[PDB]
Amino acid sequence: TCELYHYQECVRGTTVLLKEPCSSGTYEGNSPFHPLADNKFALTCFSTQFAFACPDGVKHVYQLRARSV
């Protein structure tokens, strides 16, 4: 309830488009935050983990796994 884990696979060369879990939260990750329109954000597909701390108190932890395919 205080943490929610997201998991997703991607193609190693592509660019992933994700919706922010929150309108005005804080982001922490190994990739620079690339915010977009409609509260989206993008990042190159590499196997990484990032997190969103959010006003409602729920920490959204994302895990991407890159696939050579």
Whole-number Å distance between alpha carbons of 51 and 28: 5
Q: How was this structure determined?
A: X-ray
Question: What is the 8-class DSSP label of residue 69?
Answer: -
Domain ranges of the chain: 1-69
Tell me, rounded to whole angstroms, the distance of Cα 21 from its chain centroid.
Answer: 9
SS3 sequence, 10-66?
EECCCEEEEECCCCCCEEEECCCCEECHHHEEEEECCCEEEEEECCCCCEEEEEEEE
Point out which residues pair with 6 in neighbouring strands: 62
Cα separation values, 48 from 15, 35, 55, 60, Å: 13, 17, 24, 14
Six-digit token string for 55: 């006003």
Q: Resolution in A, one decimal?
A: 2.2
Whole-number Å distance between alpha carbons of 6 and 67: 17
